[model samples]
Target chain A: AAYATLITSDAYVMGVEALVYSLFKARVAFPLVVLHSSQVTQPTVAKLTRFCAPFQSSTWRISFRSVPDIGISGYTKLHIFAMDDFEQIVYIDADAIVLQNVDELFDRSTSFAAAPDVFPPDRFNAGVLVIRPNKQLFADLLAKAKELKSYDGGDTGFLNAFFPKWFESDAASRLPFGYNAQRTMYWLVNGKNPGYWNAVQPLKILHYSSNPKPWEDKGDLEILWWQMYTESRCMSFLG
Target chain B: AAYATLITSDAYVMGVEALVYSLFKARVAFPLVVLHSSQVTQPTVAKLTRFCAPFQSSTWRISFRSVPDIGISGYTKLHIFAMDDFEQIVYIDADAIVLQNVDELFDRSTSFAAAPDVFPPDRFNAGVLVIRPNKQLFADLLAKAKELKSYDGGDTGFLNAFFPKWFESDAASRLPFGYNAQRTMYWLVNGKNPGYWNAVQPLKILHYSSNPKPWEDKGDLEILWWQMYTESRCMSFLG
Candidate 1:
């Protein structure tokens, strides 16, 4: 089992910097893999090399050719799934952070699993996912990609459409909301009715789903992300 | 100081019933009052009287004529400010509930005060408020009603426009998010970053703003409202 993420460019490096730092803080025991675009600068890659140095040989970075933009996002995510080197990969988006040990995610047996999205009760968020890598599943999703129109206009919708039963499947297949907590859920769980947030272990992982990302906005969550960024030995790389 | 709410019709009674029950659970020391529309049936009033029996003579019910329907809501709320029996009044919407004694709200010395709205950086939520009731203040609001166009086409926007300095006002004038927690803020607090929730005491009160209110749906918080309702001694009023 391994943890995997996709980094599209140098602009995404800072977010992944915090993600890798947070993973280290969580003391993850498994290997980690990061898929990068061919155009990502070598200097940025070198900085990331030091960022993941503690994991050293346990962490691997794969450079790949960009897929023809399928008119929307998720193509890069689809390309990363072509890797079946590990039996399972807990693919988390570079924009999210793990607060503590989440190695249990790697133990799940699901071929495709994710927490339900906060807004649409039926759909699952693709930000953090648990999946078993089977070569045939990647070919199936890639082949069907162009024919299917995403319901929400992003990779989240694309994956939800691909794995339609995430909501109705077995108990283990439906991960807790804390596994991929989106900001939208905050108002409902904490503001309107905290019972939802209280029902689960709060803040297992923080996923910045929509706009005004941590680097862009100084919202409370963004502030936390910024704190993690400052604590990292990475801020110097950008300067 | 006193606690007050408005009940337009029979539909609002259940919500207010839950609110009053929660207040009793919180063991509030202040006197409570309810304002009812002329159309509210006497039988319903008697049921409510029984609902507030524990508070006895400390609670009073006032029947008032409905205001001419302004093109938007909040005219009735303006009418409530004409009440000057107390030096201060904590206005809580019937749709909201108190988890504990919010008597500290009475301690705040502000003519107009409320918690900031979750989404807007500047605006404050009108659901729960601390205000000084003055005859001239009510008259000023009533006279200015037709000329002002609310930004969001509701009383929340109308009042926000009326009190332009609420965001810039002193700290006491700006109540905590827990005072009037809107569901939209839940995503930011509980999901995006638990840091905000960690910053405050969770669930001091549950204010139901926006759609699918507790009665209309069974969200986790709605389930909480229903639980408070079932534990109450007043459910036999209708059935």
Candidate 2:
């Protein structure tokens, strides 16, 4: 079993850096397999070699079609289901960071499991997922791609459509809100103050699903992202 | 110093019964104060005497207007603020019940505090509130009733306008989603399963804010309401 993530563009490198550091710091005992796009600059890969990145799951048939129309910048993320090496994988978004040791999640249920989205809570957010990585499941994801269109679009919408019952399968299949605390959570009513984010206490993972991502701006939560980024300078390659 | 709520019509008595039972079950040390309309039947009052009752916080000048316009059946509810006898009060809607002991909320911050609404979540639901009663604060609420005008209308809109920056306040002033788990939370993207309501854990209070009220419908969450209602028949008055 292992953890996996993605890095689609140079714009996302810093997010990966912080995400990697968080997992490492949380002391997760698994390798984080990643998928990156072909056009990612050599220097970006050079810096990311320590993390092993990806924008697509497979080397070939990699595509970014129909994303803008769906409003999700992902179709390629389903490759996470294609990582056949690991018996199980916990796929986290680069735009998210671990706040605590969620290594327990890796040991949980379903060939596929995900946290619910904030607004509707009926569908799943593909941001954080726990999967057993069955080849048949991977095939199903591809086969059903055009057969069912997600309401929200993007990998999240698609994934929700793929496993429409994940939310209803049982606790074993539905990850808690803590694993994928969306940025909208910060202002989601208990109060908008920075630290007030703790209203949903014991938050295990923090996702920058909103704009002004931590790497782009140093807001309250972003400060933690910067801290992780600074420590990961240890990833600096030897000349 | 107390827990309180309101009952506009006989349609809400069952909700109050379950809500009172929940608080009693949670073992809160506070008495629940209630205000009901003049037309509340003697039989309904007899049952609710165990929880006290309300249609308005005050006996005189009671009215229920402009609620349907704003898509809310509230305004007379603002009477909760005029309960001057209590040094502190936690106002919960009758359609809601405590899931666990939230007596600690009475010990927290802000002259007033509330849970966030499920949609937008930019404002409070007014379904649950914690407050230190002040005549002046109550006066201001009455003064702003028409002048401020709630975006969502009802007392919630008026109150949100009065404390527009509550969301920007520190932890002490903001109640967590747990304190007032709205019905919208059930279908809010995690899944539509009955128990999946737990996607957001430690839900301290449950609000049946959706239509086809629990008293009217015996769906999953509503079953709990039935249980509470049944047990409280200890309130059966001896003729």
Candidate 3:
């Protein structure tokens, strides 16, 4: 009945936490699942739990998990697990932050959604994503990931290698520009909004897609909004 | 019987160790003492001792002294004790090294020797002190230190306050320019003959009086000397 967001790195914890915060602030009723990376040390896990314990009333449940089977990014498996096990899912990169009600991206299970990566534009930007949890798709993705292991290092490289034709395959897979947009490219030019930022008024999810991260600087307003929502309930490395 | 130096904080142990190393490598004859301020932690003392032990030789004995004293600058009753105990004692600050034989410094028995302060070129630099201990003079200095303590925070200010006329009153008490030289005021501009570095070649003792220290790369030659010391077994932290 609801969408869930998943992430797996301690480094990405702050970004993901902000996403959850933004989502809850928008009153989006859903679950946020964190499949923590191995880098999340013992102390980190304890802090995350303590931070998330107080937000039960928000109807947003934040769960932490060790990789069920550590391989290439188990994002596809996570999608399937969330859909089959509990509810629909809104998959966002841990580095992304949601700004407004973006549940529209997951309006349907048969269709996939993600911001179209353009301008200096690579074929894909994995920052903000929406997917339906399908068991067969996940199994296929994993098999494909393992087969491509000899070629690249991470989930991104694996995805690009495995789904080389993803961009041209179907129209439904590409979410609108407003759904997700990078903020770094915008900041570099003083928020001039060359193509991506100019294409929309207010982004549904302010995906912090580049470096000089929000936690690094206290002045990031968009990141501050995300912090307000997610930070309200959970303990995080951000503080 | 011996002159000593110490780093009173764990933060300064590395510097003190390097100092010990250089002194040992030069084949210093007098017993080397480490008069650690008792306020230092146990671990720091252990670290300094461990660093100096390897350079232990028959000619030079390495010993420890835990001082039951406190002062902002080392110029008080604690300082007077060296004069009381040893007939002729030198207190080289932890931040200095003896480059040559300084056995001649003890030849004069009635007075004290010190480098002139750098900025004003008037006040004596108490850090590198050479005192030919006199029981009566030491007692007088001690009494003056106690009297000044009511108005001054530490030894430097107190000595400056009480001995307001010593520099003018005593002329033979003054040592040569080479004995105690403020580090940087001396060379590069070699025309200043009164400055120590320009006048004294092959310095008997080099004061690395800067915060980062000579061996710690506060200067080019300091780093070079430090590296030279490090590569040889003679100049070691445990020496």
Candidate 4:
């Protein structure tokens, strides 16, 4: 099994580095992988390579792949299901902070699974997903990508469309929001519905789902992302 | 045609009163109708009857109807289509504040129309609807209400289920969000997408969509609700 993420542009370079380091800090034994774009500068690629060198070995591998252009690089994470290197994968967004080991998520028997979105609790967020790799699934995704117009002109809407029945399919198909707890989850729990917090307490991941990302601006939850960034030694490259 | 709202409980008594007052203040000449539950106290009903007495007995006459128990009071708004008194009607949520005359909405040709929800932006909100009163349509709704489960356990989900194609059916079936702008609309405009605000500037209706409603708590937009409340002399009875 592997833990996957994506780095589409220079803006997400530091974020991707921090994500990988966070996984290692959580003592996750799974191999790591990242889908990078050619748009990433050569210097940043070298920095990433050096950053991953010590952790790279035969059993514990750190690999990167150049994904083909599919109009938007954000959609590249969809390709993880096609990756033959791992039977199953846990895909985490680069802007998320991993607080604990989530290896048990791999044991859940589901083709795809993620937490509910903070805004619309009915739909699942694509930030953190436990998925099994399948070649036909990727082919199906490519077909659907061309067929539908994403509501927000992004991958999130496309993914939600692709898995419309996730909410009712199976119990294992729905992960608690703690796995991908975006900051808005806090307000939703405290403001409108207290029942929301009861479902996802002891958050495992904190996703900076919106802009000004942690590195760009200070926020209540962004402070946690920065703490993880410093612990992951991401500040060294940022300077 | 008429302007319609609901009053199910004393908690919503203040809101429904403010809504009617706001409409008259906006110089809306259409007759007003309110569907009230028997659960509302007799004293509150007396106050409401007196409040609408001035606007009674003319083209701008105000009327009230006591709705039968439908298990849940929220579902009572569905009966608006069955009211033969009005050929067409504009249904506004009691928690909404009207800022301008919306007599033009009645001129719309569609049998049913509403603004998209702030959260999903795909599903139409039941808060503001331009609907033609038809006994057959209400009958169909009653049959469907018993057949299917409302996802959110409210009229919003039931109405969305009744008109599933509102998102892509016809351009004329969708009203601008400004007509039913909820507080979350401001967040979507200022947070992720500035272009959204550019599309719907000078909002027409302000919907206090969530709990601790305008009368219960102070908010940036709630100030406007309070101003209209005072102007309508609701403050005198609220004490």
Candidate 5:
């Protein structure tokens, strides 16, 4: 298992809940750390830490670090720190949940496993990715990411330029469709029925890939799944 | 009244709620039976009935039965039932909400009453179907469904193959598309405007046939007719 980090803004306990459940289920044997922005504080972190304690096993350990918040515009200022501290590291987005054990993710040959866009073919989903930390590679990646931020800022536009033809030239770079099946509104809006992408097999992880997630719909199951995770973490909440 | 079933997981309470609530609002005039799987509990079925009683002059009067629940993992299953029961019955998926009294659906001949598969020319949606339940139709459907379980076992694939070319071939088997006028995904994926299909006319039953259902994002007032029906049945709760 590789080191893990979560990126989030508000104290929406759901994100933490999902990450803990997925990490625990994946049986990831490594230090799991949440890199919260300086804006996140003791009370909020304590609340989340309390909620996630049950799922914590011997191999599972968590730590919180407060980093200077990197704005979309001040991205370059933050680029230096991305690869300065680590030799081998992977960054899995906070919004993803692993339904299956994917400890073998590091065993693969690639530097990253990105999801391809079925709509436009070859475009990658930036969510739920792996990163190998290197000072030089980090400097180059940071420069390119910041440059892309100056342009589109949405990681896809940056990545489209940085990793030009990973799909075409590199076999290791290509990820299975099931890994990051893009959940755009068009797929659901335009399809004949549910399960439009029936080819998305053996779903190891699920990304609520679009906004207006289950939480917004209150009592909706998808949202409830996240909420259940949140509640599971609060087992010590005395009735 | 035709029998009904909850063809989903143990977690689908809202779906079951939406079903019974809509039935109450439609003021269905006879005994409405709900056949949930044993996976769902007596308390759940009791809660559904209790949630339904306050809004009616009389109870919606639905009976709940438990079958040995089996679902195609990561797929859909749409069998019109293989059990010994009524000779012919209507099989309406939980996704549909009857806007008007659906007692008339039982009158439509024992043959399948379904709208054409908007995609495959021969296939039809099993969302709102009238089948003269027989050993042969049930066996053949279940067999073909199992064979192609991994791929689109959803109503369209299974039903289209079962009633291939039947939509155009036999007048008696095909019900008017208006009876099962779909709302969400059909409008989103196919075309934004109803003008393409000339669908502005009054519809019979509305099918919320997509993901992120109308409940997720309430679009125009028209497509949300099912949501309206469900809420009306539970108006007392709101009151």
Candidate 6:
């Protein structure tokens, strides 16, 4: 399976580049497919190209491709299922930092998989998703996008509506909370429950879905993201 | 200058040990003074002794002392002010995890200093405090304790009552929120005031004052405490 992330603007380029570096840092051996848009600048694209140059020659690869705007920046991630280059892919949001190797996810037999969102426990968060790409499904997403407007003006509602079977689906289709741990998971495990430390010990990825991305703000948890960005191979490019 | 924490029972011994290790790990250069109640078990005292052995015979010291219970568990920390040996002390709660060096607090000229509690912004959190040990003040606190019950039945209410002038004090007497950050802070920062992150960036200590500490249940922030615990010099003794 390949890893995928999206860059919609010049603002998210550093974050996407950092995500790629974090994956390599964590020793996750997977080719990366970065999808971007026309809104990104040439300088940022050059930075991305430099960051990915090391892996270009071998099977270990990083590819950057431009796509038409999916209206809202969030909807672009929904197109991951349609990318024909990789049969199976794990799409992580640009704002997320990988904590450990999750390459074993490719071995799981599933068409689509995601961790449940903490706020609405039944709904799956779209931040980290494992999917098997298909061209027809990509076209269906585009057709549905025209007919339906997302409730929060994000892809979550549209995707949840598309995959209504996820709620009642078998456990095999649902990834653990560690895969898409949001602020709610932090609160749930630490707020009133002190018994969950070991339960969350194996957390694989940390999603910065909340406000104040590490580049802008500094909280204890957010500091980890900044540390990763600073230590990543892409820092010299970020400078 | 010295750092102090409490161990009311055998349960908190490991936590206090972890705090000492975290402080040292952060490169904080103050000696530690751990006060425990007579109620603590012998095996726990042995563990504390073993943990402190390395810091002995040198300027970097860790001493474990037993204090007579002042009837209430929370009142034990009140004894630090009269500890005679150390003129200046920074009292940290057992559940607190030091993230960085706070050694400069010794240079602060205030007789007392602490961050404001989130629940009652006017009141200071006793989780982390800088104080000058004074026997007369400690006696006065005991005298006042007999006449009045604290509002929260904890040290915070009694301490606030004792230090009513703290709210009107100069800036030097008030510490930045980073010094005594609690879980409530995560919500306050990420909840509605996303802008607060930059303001709290320089946070020095992380207080797990809420329920389900890392030893109990796992919360996202508490995981950091466990990580520190696993990485500390005291881990071998913890077993």
Name the best candidate (by TM-score): 4
lDDT of 1 by residue, B74-121 (tens): 557775577787789888998998887898888876788887664333
Error of 5 at B234 (Å): 63
Which candidate leads the pack in DockQ?
A: 2
TM-score of candidate 5's chain B against its reference?
Answer: 0.77
Please identify model 2 stretches exceeding 4 Å from their true place. Answer: A50-73, A190-196, A234-239, B1-239
Taking the tens digit of each residue's C-alpha lDDT, what string does model 6 give over A144-223?
88877554457876787687556445545667677776744454455444333233436788888866666655455677
Give the TM-score ranking, best first.
Answer: 4, 2, 1, 6, 5, 3
* Winner of 2 and 5 under lDDT: 2
lDDT by residue (tens digit), candidate 2, A44-71: 8666664433322243122211111112
Model 6 residue A109 CA deviation (Å) reads 71
Candidate 3 runs further than 4 Å off: A1-239, B72-77, B80-83, B133-143, B146-154, B169-172, B186-196, B214-218, B232-239
Comparison by TM-score, 1 against 2, better one: 2
**Per-residue alpha-carbon lDDT of model 3 for A1-239, expressed as tens digits?**
45455545566556555665666667666666666655567676777667656544645777766654445544433343335564456667666666687666656444455554422122345555566667777767766665665222345445555555544434456555556566654554334324323424456666665456665444355546454645654433353
DockQ of each: 0.02, 0.05, 0.00, 0.04, 0.02, 0.01
| Model 2 docking tier (incorrect/acceptable/medium/high) | incorrect
The per-residue C-alpha lDDT of model 1 at residue B144 equals 76
* Full ranking by DockQ: 2, 4, 5, 1, 6, 3
Interface RMSD of each: 17.7, 11.7, 35.7, 10.2, 15.3, 18.5
* Model 6 stretches with alpha carbons more than 4 Å out: A1-239, B54-59, B187-198, B233-239
lDDT string, candidate 2, B118-233, tens digits = 54343467889888877787677767675776655457666777887655555566666777787756644345334335435567888888678877764556777677677766
Candidate 5: Cα lDDT at B177: 57
* Selected candidate, larger DockQ, 3 vs 5: 5
TM-score of chain A of 6: 0.90
